[PDB]
């Protein structure tokens, strides 16, 4: 919760998870894939993560030491989601963060690559991006048409993929 | 990269060096010429401690107004065992870079807005006073 | 038409800033290795990119997509030793 | 380590090598503004002459007046020069391409311009003649007084941004510029821009007629190239500020429609061409602006100092507080509050 | 006020130690504040870590000794 | 008798449009811009010479 | 904690023994207003808040207005004299 | 309604000429009167010392501070009423006591500064307000600029004000360096047991106190209080007293202070003996101003002293206020006037005041009896109730050095009367003009308060018992 | 190692390479080559910089507001607008007192030819 | 946007009378003040010009009994409205504290609260704020009628909690 | 000459007069007075006529208030 030093030195410890906690399948996803699939792991693993922050709340002082069962719980289901999308829409999902690896991860960059993915995951993995807190008669901003902030350079692959989504009638 | 370690202990001594030249100066303006360097060493110490914000705040206001103000006046004369590396974690609770400056702008405006409101009268007094003195109306 | 001799040093400066911007594109992409720059360092993003360097192995922003972790991922993770601040 | 020391050299020959031909360009302009030819004897089309200026100027002597502390006459040229040269970090040159990106851009951008007064006040104190001192007084008082409004519109710019990073402003500015909604802001900024530079719509203080042959110090030599180059660095530095936070910074149009026609994939050619066109939009705005400074330098006489302080505090600055009352209010009418 | 604020406007290092102290005071009248003392001392260890520094210099002296 | 504020034919808004928006400033600015796009006069003296009368001395 | 203490204390010792130069008193006082900062700012730093920074921005401002007021007091002190 | 006055009136003064300077002050006089009269009922805002913390843990409004909050308006009505009214309609009294343009602005700025101390919970509001009133007194000293002693005293006040600025700020910094608060709930008789917050709160106290004339820092305020003009001193020897002393008595941050007790002894001693060999009246009067703040240091030591404080405040801010106005009247009858800014200096000059009138003398005599505790006066019961608080908590040697201080004080207070009733050889028989009526009527009011103030001795005790507890 | 810190350090050395190049390249360094009583002023010289400090200072006072302006929705608006509306009348004190008027004693002798 | 989520005293009186509110909203204070209260405003507005005419009748400025300028009368009228309005707000909002006579307004706030319960909207109305800002702005406006001598401060907030029984 | 009629003799005439003689004051002052007056009156209208506000942005992880039910899945 604090920025680093004048001259901080990094350090690590070659030790292990000692006795009781079994090993987990720890998320080996870099920022751009998990940022892309953030809505879907928030959609499927909603009450699990909600339980996580609830249990971290009620464990005042215990905190970190209490909910190890739950840190085991909430990561694994997200790993299940990303493995299912590794099997599901790996071309288009990868393409979404092939676009999103530029633009400083600004989500404003890759609308045309995004809407191709929204049909795909809702087809096979049958999940959906939903923005909570958005009261009705208010357009969700990745659903709207003619945005004000149009991005800098759309990638060359997903624009052709978008045209082919129109020609195949998948859109 | 062990030369990196003593950075802070550089600028402390360079501070101690500088202040001696404040209180040992022939001319008046030579003293403030050392003093602006003391402000700069201070701002580098603020950048080195981890407040890059206030380093430049001071350059805007100390060697911005008040030093240059002192220069402007002094022109107008006629004739001359705590050695423990603290451990820093990483938590993911923050969501947006509400930096130090944002939260100043929140506490000055919500929690303690009355201080800024009376500070308006202090800045009022800064206007009235020099006009209260240096004018001789009619 | 126009006096070209007047615009000729302006043509120079218009070329000089252009060549500067071209080289300042190329060097930054060559540092990044294929992607653009990052015009906004967030604290969220700073911890994130530390994690990403920690994940990919060696490289800066290789940005890999993997199901699970490597075995060194349980061991590569570091803390930061801030100095005593005297 | 290797690719950054070339990253700073290419920027040096992009800027320091350009600011000389700026001083050639001003002569070419004022030639055709007053219906005569520019320098033509010196180079091929009369280019290069700033080299012949400097190399001669580096060969003249270091005659020093007896009333001046010589160290002070070393410090003020050097610090004015390096002030207007370390103002060159977070000029943006395309998206996020600065020398060092840091999230507090404007604060550095503005504190170094705040340091810009500190050399010119210090300079007239050496050679302590009474006219030589009081000229420094008259210069520094306007040099702070419009440094106010120069500073003071930078906050209403970021009432649309709410972020101190400079390259964030242009990506905010993609939907629309800031000059085209806020037009009289540009006019008062343009006169505030030529104020903080020594420009003679406003620089009365370089009156050789008033002083005993005094412009500032007549201190010449390789001292003379220092304040001189600092002045012309200050020119296109404040032009750069005008470029990003008021005008289209590196933006020209959408140009994605063009790109998907041209390329099929990302490649170093594509980065090359996009960085070219972003730098060229920045260049064309910057190069029209450096011309506009001369275009107002020609057509107008100088001021009275009474006119100059009346021009600051009475006619410009209450209108600036009127801006401070209308733009938070226009922000308040709609929801419209900007987030980082 | 700026009571339990942080750099990023969240909660500081010892907010919990502060609030567990304030929970210690809101349920407690004077002449019974003595039981509040270990809640207070837990706060003070946040600020200056005097018990922690005393813990660490001893084990550092043992590590120096061997 | 010279005209006052109220013996003036134009509106205060119209007068102050010329005040703030600087009509006669941009007017002369347009003048010198027009002279930018015209011919100079000067001659290349070691290559061209000015007028010489027969009664020059 | 060393640097703000030492700037403050050396400014204090400079204020005491250097009366008869009067501007030196001002600038030692100004460095005192810097030294209180250099202790307080790092207390904000070490204590994970901006509450000390809240007091710090105010004492920056008050150091400013001090330099605004008292230097006009100086100009009043020298108008009635000559030198 | 201070700010609601100020923001209108500085626009009003800026839109005004120079001859309106009396009339603006007449307006502000009547204004503050009607602020007091029409809004007095806010003492009803509590019944059992019910204390409000307003603007979010920042200000503190209570049973106690409402009194001082009324008191400052009451004295400002008098100070304003000096300016706005002529003394006489003479040439002399218009080249004397003519206010500047910006003066009445600086007063309400100072009253804002004084009230935001006494109502302050936070140290930050404390620091802002002490800077505010310090800048106020900087200007209000320096405003009568064309006097050499005035500017010299302004600089002299300035540098000690800067030291106490940085010293109070260093105390706040140190208290923050050991604790993450700035308020004063964090004391609550528990941290005092287990943490050495003695020396830090002591250093807070000393820095707050040395803006008074506390006897280590002794000569410099006295040099001010004579080098000021005779008018400004009657304001600036009062407001910095009762502002910060009401703060320090409101929060008893140093209880059984070893330091404050010794400084209280030394304060009383050197003030009493410093009043002795002096012929300059502004000196003598300022040393009276010292020793009475000497008694204030005693009231700082105690626990739960809201009676003896407030009663001695309303004693002192009447008596000390009124004796100036008496010698402001007395300069008409004297035979030698120097120094346009400061007409009387030497106490010799009012040699024959009783053969001018008996009644200004009698009014002077009872107020100088009021400083020495003469029992049928209001000035007495102050010292009486001080001592009822002193031996309440066993400051025995403090009580006997109070007696020594009272006797050595009362020696030099009578020196005024030694001068005042003697022979003059050149007596008045007929003055043309009279003194402006309601200006003198204020002094008549302020003196019947002191004489007949033991009448409401009972009712003020009942109001004390009901409201303040 | 970052080019940002290289930039502010290299430029004084570039200035030294431009500084000592004259001392290397010049020659004939220094050959042989009343101010009794007055200095003159108005308040319009001395006052501009002194009055400049609160108006410079208020920009840095207003500066933490503009970063955080989304958080203080519809209320920090109200606070800051009260702050400004104090400072603006503080400004229009001086313009009605004409604090920067530097007026001339070149009066055309208003008083007429009253004769005999 | 209506949960207080702070621990507020409930019906904690300030005098012998029942309260209504800890800070009445500024529109409400106008909406409940007695007709005798408006007389305090009017007599305060008349007091200042009569005060200056008084004060010059007592002792004139330049020895002549002369009425002052109309400029002084207009500005005294302004400040008289200031004093009258401060007195009006001060005398009115005590009755919400239960510290002076609370007879008709306790009836009217058994009406208008019940009038908007049946109307189905919020008992105080929606402010345009996140609830944390509602808390902090009400912490600013809490008890701020005290210290009316120093500065006027008011309740423009319309936050949820008011020291009511439950809502 | 354009000396003064006075604000307190005829207002609207004096407003016209200042607009003819000192627009540096009055056209800063008009922009200044148009701020808060429009800020007071227009904001009820926009919620009534144009469009209502936005949903508030969350500032942390939003915590609901529930009782930690039995949640199965991913034991091993």
From Swiss-Prot, chain B:
InterPro entries: NADH_UbQ/plastoQ_OxRdtase_su6 (IPR001457), Nuo/plastoQ_OxRdtase_6_NuoJ (IPR042106). The keyword Calcium does not apply. Keywords: Electron transport, Membrane, Mitochondrion, NAD, Respiratory chain, Translocase, Transmembrane, Transmembrane helix, Transport, Ubiquinone. GO terms for cellular component: mitochondrial membrane. Gene3D superfamilies: NADH-ubiquinone/plastoquinone oxidoreductase chain 6, subunit NuoJ. It catalyses: a ubiquinone + NADH + 5 H(+)(in) = a ubiquinol + NAD(+) + 4 H(+)(out). Complex I is composed of 37 different subunits. This is NADH-ubiquinone oxidoreductase chain 6. It comes from Yarrowia lipolytica (strain CLIB 122 / E 150).
Curated annotation (Swiss-Prot), chain G:
Its EC number is 7.1.1.2. Gene3D superfamilies: 1.10.287.3510. Coiled coil: none annotated. It is found in: Mitochondrion membrane. GO terms for biological process: ATP synthesis coupled electron transport. One of its GO terms (cellular component) is mitochondrial membrane. It is a multi-pass membrane protein. The chain crosses the membrane at residues 21-41, 55-75. It catalyses: a ubiquinone + NADH + 5 H(+)(in) = a ubiquinol + NAD(+) + 4 H(+)(out). It is an enzyme of class 7 (translocase). GO terms for molecular function: NADH dehydrogenase (ubiquinone) activity. Keywords: Electron transport, Membrane, Mitochondrion, NAD, Respiratory chain, Translocase, Transmembrane, Transmembrane helix, Transport, Ubiquinone. It comes from the Eukaryota. Belongs to the complex I subunit 4L family. PANTHER family: NADH-UBIQUINONE OXIDOREDUCTASE CHAIN 4L, NADH-UBIQUINONE OXIDOREDUCTASE SUBUNIT ND4L. Complex I is composed of 37 different subunits. Core subunit of the mitochondrial membrane respiratory chain NADH dehydrogenase (Complex I) that is believed to belong to the minimal assembly required for catalysis. Complex I functions in the transfer of electrons from NADH to the respiratory chain. The immediate electron acceptor for the enzyme is believed to be ubiquinone. This is NADH-ubiquinone oxidoreductase chain 4L. It comes from Yarrowia lipolytica (strain CLIB 122 / E 150) (Yeast). The lineage of its organism: Eukaryota, Fungi, Dikarya, Ascomycota, Saccharomycotina.
């Amino acid at each position: 919760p604090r920025e680093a030093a004048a001259h901080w030195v990094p350090f690590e410890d070659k030790a292990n998870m000692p006795d009781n906690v079994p090993d987990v399948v720890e998320v080996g996803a870099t920022s751009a894939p998990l940022l892309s699939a953030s809505y879907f792991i928030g959609a499927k693993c909603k009450p699990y993560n909600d339980d996580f922050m609830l249990c971290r709340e009620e464990s005042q002082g215990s905190g970190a030491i209490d909910c190890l069962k739950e840190g085991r719980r909430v990561t694994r289901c997200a790993v299940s989601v990303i493995e299912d999308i590794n099997k599901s829409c790996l071309d288009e999902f990868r393409l979404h963060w092939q676009c999103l690896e530029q633009n400083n991860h600004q989500l404003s960059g890759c609308r045309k690559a995004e809407a191709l993915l929204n049909k795909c995951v809702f087809t096979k993995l049958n999940l959906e991006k939903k923005i909570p807190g958005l009261r009705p008669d208010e357009e969700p901003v990745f659903l709207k048409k003619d945005p004000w902030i149009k991005p800098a350079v759309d990638d060359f692959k997903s624009v052709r993929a978008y045209a082919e989504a129109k020609k195949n009638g998948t859109l | 990269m062990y030369l990196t370690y003593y950075f802070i202990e550089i600028t402390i001594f360079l501070a101690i060096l500088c202040t001696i030249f404040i209180i040992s100066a022939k001319n008046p303006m030579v003293s403030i010429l050392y003093m602006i360097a003391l402000f700069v060493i201070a701002a580098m110490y603020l950048y080195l401690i981890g407040l890059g914000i206030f380093s430049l705040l001071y350059i805007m206001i100390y060697i911005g107004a008040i030093a240059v103000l002192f220069l402007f006046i002094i022109t107008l004369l006629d004739i001359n065992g705590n050695d423990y590396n603290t451990i820093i974690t990483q938590d993911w609770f923050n969501i947006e870079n509400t930096t130090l400056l944002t939260t100043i702008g929140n506490v000055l405006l919500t929690n303690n807005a009355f201080i800024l409101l009376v500070l308006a009268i202090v800045l009022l007094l800064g206007i009235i006073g020099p006009i209260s003195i240096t004018m001789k109306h009619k | 038409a126009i006096p070209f001799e007047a615009l000729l040093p302006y043509g120079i400066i218009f070329g000089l800033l252009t060549a500067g911007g071209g080289a300042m594109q190329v060097l930054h992409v060559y540092r990044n290795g294929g992607v653009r720059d990052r015009f906004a360092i967030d604290q969220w993003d700073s911890q994130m990119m530390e994690r990403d360097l920690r994940l990919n192995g060696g490289q800066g922003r290789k940005q890999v997509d993997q199901a699970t972790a490597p075995e060194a991922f349980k061991h590569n993770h570091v803390w930061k030793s801030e100095r005593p601040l005297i | 380590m290797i690719i950054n020391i070339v990253e700073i050299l290419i920027f040096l020959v992009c800027v320091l090598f350009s600011v000389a031909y700026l001083t050639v360009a001003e002569r070419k302009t004022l030639a055709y503004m007053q219906r005569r030819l520019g320098p033509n004897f010196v180079g091929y089309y009369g280019l290069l002459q700033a080299f012949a200026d400097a190399v001669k100027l580096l060969l003249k002597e270091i005659v020093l007046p007896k009333e001046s502390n010589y160290i002070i006459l070393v410090i003020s040229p050097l610090i004015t020069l390096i002030t207007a040269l370390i103002g060159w970090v977070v000029i943006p040159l395309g998206p996020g391409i600065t020398l060092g990106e840091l999230n507090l851009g404007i604060l550095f951008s503005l504190a170094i311009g705040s340091l810009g007064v500190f050399g010119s006040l210090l300079s007239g104190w050496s050679s302590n003649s009474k006219y030589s001192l009081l000229g420094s007084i008259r210069s520094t008082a306007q040099l702070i007084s419009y440094e106010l409004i120069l500073t003071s519109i930078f906050i209403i710019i970021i009432m649309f941004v709410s972020s101190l990073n400079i390259t964030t402003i242009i990506e905010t500015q993609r939907v629309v510029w800031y000059c085209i909604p806020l037009l009289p802001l540009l006019l008062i900024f343009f006169i505030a821009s030529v104020a903080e530079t020594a420009r003679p719509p406003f620089d009365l203080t370089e009156s050789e007629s008033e002083l005993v042959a005094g412009y500032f110090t007549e201190y010449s030599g390789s001292p003379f190239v220092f304040f001189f180059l600092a002045e012309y660095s200050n020119i296109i530095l404040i032009s750069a500020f005008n470029g990003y936070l008021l005008l289209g910074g590196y933006l020209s149009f959408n140009y994605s429609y063009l790109f998907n026609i041209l390329f099929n994939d990302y490649s170093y050619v594509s980065f090359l061409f996009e960085g070219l066109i972003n730098s060229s939009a920045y260049a064309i705005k910057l190069v029209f602006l450096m011309f506009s400074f001369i275009w107002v330098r020609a057509a107008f006489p100088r001021f009275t100092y009474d006119n100059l302080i009346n021009f600051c505090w009475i006619i410009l600055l209450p209108l600036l507080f009127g801006i401070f009352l209308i733009i938070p209010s226009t922000l308040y009418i709609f929801d419209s509050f900007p987030t980082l | 006020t700026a009571a339990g604020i942080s750099l990023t406007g969240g909660r500081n290092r010892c907010f919990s130690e502060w609030q567990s102290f304030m929970h210690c005071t809101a349920k407690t009248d004077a002449k019974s504040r003595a039981q509040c003392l270990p809640n207070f001392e837990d706060y003070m260890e946040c600020l200056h870590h005097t018990k922690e520094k005393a813990r660490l210099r001893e084990i550092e002296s043992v590590l120096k000794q061997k | 008798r010279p005209a006052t504020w109220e013996e003036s034919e134009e509106g205060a808004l119209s007068k102050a449009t010329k005040y703030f928006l600087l009509a006669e400033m941009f007017r002369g600015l347009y003048v010198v811009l027009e002279q930018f796009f015209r011919a100079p006069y000067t001659i290349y003296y070691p290559f061209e010479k000015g007028p010489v009368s027969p009664r020059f001395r | 904690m060393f640097i703000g203490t030492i700037i403050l204390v050396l400014s204090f010792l400079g204020f005491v023994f250097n009366r008869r130069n009067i501007i030196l008193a001002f600038i030692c006082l100004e460095t005192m207003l810097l030294g209180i900062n250099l202790i307080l700012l790092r207390n904000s730093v070490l204590f994970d808040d901006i509450s000390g920074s809240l007091f710090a921005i105010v004492i920056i401002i008050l150091a400013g207005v001090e330099s605004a007021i008292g230097l006009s007091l100086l100009v009043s002190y020298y108008r009635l004299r000559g030198v | 309604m201070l700010i609601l006055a100020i923001i209108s009136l500085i626009t009003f003064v800026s839109m005004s000429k120079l001859s309106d300077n009396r009339a603006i002050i007449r307006l502000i006089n009547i204004y503050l009167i009607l602020v007091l009269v029409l809004d007095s009922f806010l003492y009803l805002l509590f019944l059992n010392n019910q204390t409000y913390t307003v603007m979010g843990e920042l200000l503190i409004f209570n049973s106690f501070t409402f009194y001082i909050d009324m008191l400052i308006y009451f004295i400002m009505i008098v100070i304003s009423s000096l300016y706005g009214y002529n003394l006489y309609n003479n040439n002399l009294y218009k080249t004397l006591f003519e206010p500047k343009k910006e003066l009445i602005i600086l007063f309400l700025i100072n009253i804002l500064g004084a009230l935001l101390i006494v109502h302050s919970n936070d140290f930050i509001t404390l620091f802002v307000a002490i800077e505010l009133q310090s800048y106020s007194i900087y200007l209000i000293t320096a405003i009568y600029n064309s006097s050499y002693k005035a500017s010299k005293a302004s600089m002299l006040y300035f540098f000690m004000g800067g030291i106490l600025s940085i010293l109070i700020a260093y105390s706040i910094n140190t208290y923050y360096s050991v604790l993450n608060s700035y308020t004063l709930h964090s004391l609550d008789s528990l941290i005092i047991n287990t943490l050495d917050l003695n020396l830090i709160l002591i250093a807070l106290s000393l820095g707050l106190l040395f803006k008074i004339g506390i006897a280590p820092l002794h000569k410099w305020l006295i040099s001010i209080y004579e080098n000021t003009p005779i008018l400004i001193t009657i304001y600036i020897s009062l407001i910095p007293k009762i502002s910060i002393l009401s703060y320090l008595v409101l929060s008893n941050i140093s209880i059984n202070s070893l330091v404050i007790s010794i400084l209280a002894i030394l304060t009383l001693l050197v003030g009493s003996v410093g009043g002795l060999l002096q012929i300059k009246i502004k000196r003598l009067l300022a040393f009276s101003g010292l020793t009475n703040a000497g008694y204030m240091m005693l009231l700082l030591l105690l626990n739960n002293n809201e009676f003896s404080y407030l009663y001695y405040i309303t004693q002192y801010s009447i008596s000390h206020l009124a004796i100036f106005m008496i010698i402001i009247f007395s300069i008409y009858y004297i035979n030698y006037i120097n120094n346009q800014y400061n007409p009387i200096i030497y106490v010799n000059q009012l040699k024959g005041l009783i053969h001018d009138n008996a009644y200004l003398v009698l009014s002077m005599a009872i107020v100088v009896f009021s400083f020495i505790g003469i029992p049928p006066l209001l000035g007495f019961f102050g010292k009486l109730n001080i001592l009822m608080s002193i031996l309440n908590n066993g400051y025995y040697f403090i009580s006997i050095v109070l007696i020594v201080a009272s006797l050595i004080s009362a020696l030099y207070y009578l020196y005024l009367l030694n001068v005042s009733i003697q022979d003059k050889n050149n007596i008045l028989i007929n003055s043309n003009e009279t003194v402006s009526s309601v200006l003198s009527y204020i002094l008549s009011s302020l003196i019947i308060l002191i004489t007949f103030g033991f009448i409401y001795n009972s009712l003020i005790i009942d109001i004390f018992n009901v409201y303040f507890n | 190692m970052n080019t940002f810190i290289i930039f502010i350090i290299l430029i004084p050395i570039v200035g030294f390479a431009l500084l000592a190049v004259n001392i290397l390249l010049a020659v004939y360094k220094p050959y042989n080559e009343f101010n009794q009583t007055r200095l003159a002023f108005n308040a319009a010289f001395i006052l501009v910089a002194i009055l400049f400090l609160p108006f410079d200072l208020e920009i840095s006072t207003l500066l933490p507001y503009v970063m955080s302006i989304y958080l203080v929705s519809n209320y920090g608006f109200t606070i800051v607008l009260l702050f400004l509306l104090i400072l603006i009348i503080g400004f229009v004190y001086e313009i009605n007192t004409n604090a920067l008027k530097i007026n001339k004693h070149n009066k055309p002798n208003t008083d007429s030819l009253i004769y005999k | 946007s209506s949960t207080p989520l702070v621990k507020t005293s409930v019906n904690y009186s300030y005098g012998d009378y029942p309260l209504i509110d800890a800070d009445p909203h500024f529109k409400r204070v106008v909406g409940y003040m007695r007709p005798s209260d408006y007389g305090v405003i009017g007599l305060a507005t008349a007091a200042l010009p009569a005060g200056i005419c008084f004060a010059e009748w007592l002792d004139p400025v330049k020895g002549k009994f002369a009425r002052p300028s109309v400029k002084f009368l207009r500005v005294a009228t302004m400040l008289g409205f200031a004093v009258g309005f401060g007195a009006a707000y001060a005398r009115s909002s005590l009755r919400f504290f239960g510290v002076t006579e609370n007879a008709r307004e306790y009836k009217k706030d058994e009406a208008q609260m019940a009038a908007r319960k049946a109307a189905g909207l919020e008992p105080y109305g929606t402010s345009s704020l996140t609830p944390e800002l509602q808390e902090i702005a009400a912490k600013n406006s809490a008890h701020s009628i005290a210290g009316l001598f120093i500065f006027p401060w008011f309740n423009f907030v319309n936050h949820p909690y008011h020291g009511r029984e439950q809502k | 000459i354009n000396a003064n009629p006075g604000f307190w003799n005829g207002p609207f005439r004096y407003l016209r007069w200042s607009a003819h003689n000192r627009p540096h004051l009055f056209f800063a002052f008009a922009i200044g007075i148009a701020g808060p007056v429009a800020a007071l009156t227009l904001t009820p209208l926009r919620r009534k006529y144009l469009y209502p506000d936005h949903s508030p942005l969350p500032q942390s992880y939003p915590l609901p208030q529930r009782a930690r039910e039995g949640l199965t899945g991913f034991d091993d």
